[PDB]
Structure formats: C-alpha cells, structure tokens
UniProtKB/Swiss-Prot annotation:
Tissues and organs where the protein is expressed, per its UniProt entry: Placenta, pancreatic carcinoma cell lines.
Taxonomic classification: Eukaryota, Metazoa, Chordata, Craniata, Vertebrata
Protein's organism: Homo sapiens
Free-text description of this protein's post-translational modifications in UniProt: The N-terminus is blocked.
Entry superkingdom: Eukaryota
Parts of the chain on the Cytoplasmic side: 1-26
Residue numbers of the full-length protein present here: 298 to 323 of 323
Function recorded in the entry: May function as a growth factor receptor.
Location(s), subcellular: Membrane
Disorder: Corneal dystrophy, gelatinous drop-like: A form of lattice corneal dystrophy, a class of inherited stromal amyloidoses characterized by pathognomonic branching lattice figures in the cornea. GDLD is an autosomal recessive disorder characterized by severe corneal amyloidosis leading to blindness. Clinical manifestations, which appear in the first decade of life, include blurred vision, photophobia, and foreign-body sensation. By the third decade, raised, yellowish-gray, gelatinous masses severely impair visual acuity.
The protein, known as: Tumor-associated calcium signal transducer 2
Family stated for the protein in its record: Belongs to the EPCAM family.
Amino acid sequence: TNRRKSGKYKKVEIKELGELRKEPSL
C-alpha cells in the first residue's frame, strides 16, 4: 500500500487468526 499504517495494521494479521480468542499466529 502507499501507506502501511504499520503496527496497527500489523496486529490485524494475528487478529484475523483469532488473538481475540487468544489463538496466536505463532
């Protein structure tokens, strides 16, 4: 993207993996 919006964007990756349920992406 033209702007990464990083960190806030980066957490969305593990958020979709379910960090809200405590399921990690690692």
